[PDB]
């Protein structure tokens, strides 16, 4: 694992890592090859180039509480020159609209968020996939939350 010399990573969340989004490389159909590395939980670029970056996250809950919580998912670039950080891809999601079924009955809600796009990156740039409310993640099943990149 694996032929193709194009730097790649498709990484997946740690379910047994409560309270945060941790990316596991050592699993299933997870990738991490040709110079790409996973380090302070960030994907690290081995070469100047064009890269497709994607991530999906899946939030869940049962019923609605305090008027509003908003879920967000972003991919940041932190750069070797620009020692600072910027969003390449973002998205906010609002599940249950205050509803608060205070009559009764609490239903399952699920809210996925997909981020994808092509960016030019420099050797040693660090990519970061973050969310605001890690405790609303679904850690129960396979292809549900993940973070990938590939050189073109």
């Amino acid at each position: 694992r694996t032929p193709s010399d194009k730097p790649v990573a498709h990484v997946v969340a740690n379910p047994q890592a409560e309270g945060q989004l941790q990316w596991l490389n050592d699993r299933a159909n997870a990738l991490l090859a040709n110079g790409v590395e996973l380090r302070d939980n960030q994907l690290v670029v081995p070469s100047e180039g064009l890269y497709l970056i994607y991530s999906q996250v899946l939030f869940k809950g049962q019923g609605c509480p305090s008027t509003h919580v908003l879920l967000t998912h972003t991919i940041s670039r932190i750069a070797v020159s620009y020692q600072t950080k910027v969003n390449l891809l973002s998205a906010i999601k609002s599940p249950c609209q205050r509803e608060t079924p205070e009559g009764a009955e609490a239903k399952p809600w699920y809210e996925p968020i997909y981020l994808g796009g092509v960016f030019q990156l420099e050797k040693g740039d660090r990519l970061s996939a973050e969310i605001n409310r890690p405790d609303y993640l679904d850690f129960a099943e396979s292809g549900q939350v993940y973070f990938g990149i590939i050189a073109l």
């Epitope: 049962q62 399952p108 129960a140 099943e141 396979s142």
Partner: antibody
Framework: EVQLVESGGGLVQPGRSLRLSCAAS????????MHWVRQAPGKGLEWVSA????????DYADSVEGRFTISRDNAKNSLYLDMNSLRAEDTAVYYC??????????????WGQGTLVTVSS | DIQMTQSPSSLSASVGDRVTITCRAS??????LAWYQQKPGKAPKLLIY???TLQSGVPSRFSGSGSGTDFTLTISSLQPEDVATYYC?????????FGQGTKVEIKR
Amino acid sequence: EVQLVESGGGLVQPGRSLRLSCAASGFTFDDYAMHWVRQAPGKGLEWVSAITWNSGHIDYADSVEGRFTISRDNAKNSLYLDMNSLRAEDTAVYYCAKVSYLSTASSLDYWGQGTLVTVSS
Amino acid sequence: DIQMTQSPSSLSASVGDRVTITCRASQGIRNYLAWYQQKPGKAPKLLIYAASTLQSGVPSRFSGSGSGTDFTLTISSLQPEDVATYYCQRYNRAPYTFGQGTKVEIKR
């Protein structure tokens, strides 16, 4: 209405093996994850494994993984558990349970009547 | 990991008396907790899911509460048929582990 009919239980020499069955009816079986839950005699309830609607994900217990194999025929509306290399600790009544809402991570909304499996020479 | 711990392990009570069973999780599980009733030899039945939502067709004297780690099954007026063993269950997240159980018994 919803029925989960177990079969496959019985006596078995330790080291040998068994294929439990659970025949579902009264609900579109294809839309639900299923669970196996065992209960050793006098002991309490203990989750065993689970399988999603399309069989794409499977979980087992900090206690098996290598020995048991949950499976599912949707045409036959059936849930299977193939147990291998059996020891006395596997001796228990085994329940199949239909989940409440789709995902494996949902409440066990309906159970079969059980089927006892006695491991003994 | 995860420990589902229900107290007490056993309780006797008077018909009509209100009964309280508690469940503490060793790590938060939001409201991904259900209560199951199991009568002697019978298959267990789901009473509450999402901590507080009664299953349809389940008498309303049964109630639940709690989010996070501490949960409470309550029978507001114990009844002769309520004699059973009750189990809480985690469902987030596998493994879907059950508390050790709580036997319920009566006055007369």
